[PDB]
Structure 1
Amino acid sequence: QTLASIKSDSKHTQKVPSLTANETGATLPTTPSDSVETRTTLMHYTGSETTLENFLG
């Protein structure tokens, strides 16, 4: 399985994932761990339900 979230503690840094520019057209991926402290946890999910095949199938 894979993680939905990875434990992350308070940060004080120069790197700021929370600031960007949507003008670029990018939707760069961010996680809750970028905005808040988080607990480590599993997805327990494959996305099978959302496959194109199941949607139009």
Structure 2
Amino acid sequence: QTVASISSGPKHTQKVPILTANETGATMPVLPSDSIETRTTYMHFNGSETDVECF
């Protein structure tokens, strides 16, 4: 099982992942676990129907 979201509690981070610079042209992979306290969920999903062969 592939993890979709990891358990994450209060964060007093100095490495702010939610402040970035879109001027660089990169979509930094900020996750829900970075801005809110999350529980641990699983994907239960492979993405078979979004593969270009199927699309």
So what's the TM-score if we normalise by structure 1?
0.93
CA RMSD of aligned residues (A): 0.5
Q: Alpha-carbon deviation of 1:22?
A: 0.2
Tell me which residue corresponds to 2:37. Answer: 37
Q: Which runs of 4+ in 1 moved over 2 A?
A: none
Structure with the bigger percentage of strand: 2
Determine the structure 2 residue equivalent to 1:5: 5
Read off the aligned partner of 1:26 and give its amino acid letter: A
Say whether 1:49 aligns with 2:49.
yes
Cα distance in 2, alignment partners of residues 13 and 40 from structure 1: 20
Q: What TM-score comes out, normalization by structure 2 length?
A: 0.96
Equivalents in 1 of 2:46, 2:12: separation in Å? 34
Pick the structure with more helix per residue. Answer: 1
